[PDB]
UniProtKB/Swiss-Prot annotation, chain A:
Disorder: Dehydrated hereditary stomatocytosis 1 with or without pseudohyperkalemia and/or perinatal edema: An autosomal dominant hemolytic anemia characterized by primary erythrocyte dehydration. DHS erythrocytes exhibit decreased total cation and potassium content that are not accompanied by a proportional net gain of sodium and water. DHS patients typically exhibit mild to moderate compensated hemolytic anemia, with an increased erythrocyte mean corpuscular hemoglobin concentration and a decreased osmotic fragility, both of which reflect cellular dehydration. Lymphatic malformation 6: A form of primary lymphedema, a disease characterized by swelling of body parts due to developmental anomalies and functional defects of the lymphatic system. Patients with lymphedema may suffer from recurrent local infections. LMPHM6 is an autosomal recessive, severe form manifesting as generalized lymphatic dysplasia.
Protein name as catalogued: Piezo-type mechanosensitive ion channel component 1
Remarks, miscellaneous: Piezo comes from the Greek 'piesi' meaning pressure.
Self-association state and partner proteins as the record states: Homotrimer; the homotrimer forms a propeller-shaped Piezo channel with a cation-ion conducting pore. Heterotrimeric interaction may occur between PIEZO1 and PIEZO2. Interacts with PKD2. Interacts with STOML3. Interacts with TMC1, TMC2, PCDH15 and CIB2; the interaction may be part of the MET complex. Interacts with MDFIC (via C-terminus); the interaction prolongs Piezo channel inactivation. Interacts with MDFI (via C-terminus); the interaction prolongs Piezo channel inactivation.
Part of the full-length chain shown: 2232 to 2279 of 2521
Organism: Homo sapiens
């Protein structure tokens, strides 16, 4: 999990800047707020 | 551990210069009937695994194929923990002065007895019956 930095936050906000409310969400949430969901995908755990 | 990442874990202990996060989370879930807001008192006692250290070289051979390596984890099993009704398994300082070097010498033994049948016994540096029953203490509040 990566706590998004100020620069990272700017990136996300700019990605969704065209849509006002999209950018709003990101921008309103404080920097080091938006966290990165780097969920693991590898298995190993077989299933039962 | 997923096979590609198991081989990567291997590699780390084998060579890969990285520090495996050995978070020894000591979660202490109590109850709420007798009170205890965040009953679960937890603390990840992490041991950054120095790349190919004595412990990690034992782990290299552990994950190579042999199952007879007593991985020396420098005193990292809190034998006295002042846990309260909050979410923290903080050990008592002075009870364990170093409290990272005065916890309790813990050992690890992966028992891959192909028949890999990878088991994992948590031993002690001085395991008497603490390979199956490690006796620490939680100073409860």
């Amino acid at each position: 999990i990566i706590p998004f930095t100020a620069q990272a936050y700017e990136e996300l906000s700019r990605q969704f800047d065209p849509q006002p409310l999209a950018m709003q969400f990101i921008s309103q949430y404080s920097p080091e707020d938006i966290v990165t969901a780097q969920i693991e995908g590898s298995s190993g755990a077989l299933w039962r | 551990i997923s096979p590609p990442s198991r081989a990567q874990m291997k590699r780390e202990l084998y060579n890969g210069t990285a520090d495996i996060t050995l978070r020894f989370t000591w979660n202490f879930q109590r109850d709420l009937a007798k009170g205890g807001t965040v009953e679960y008192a937890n603390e990840k006692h992490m041991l950054a695994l120095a790349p190919n250290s004595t412990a990690r070289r034992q782990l290299a051979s552990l994950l190579e194929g042999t199952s007879d390596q007593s991985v020396v984890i420098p005193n990292l099993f809190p034998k006295y923990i002042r846990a309260p009704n909050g979410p923290e398994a903080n050990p008592v300082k002075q009870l364990q002065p170093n409290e990272e070097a005065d916890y309790l010498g813990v050992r690890i033994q992966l028992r891959r007895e192909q028949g890999f049948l990878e088991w994992w016994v948590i031993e002690l540096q001085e395991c008497r019956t603490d390979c199956n029953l490690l006796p620490m203490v939680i100073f409860s509040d």
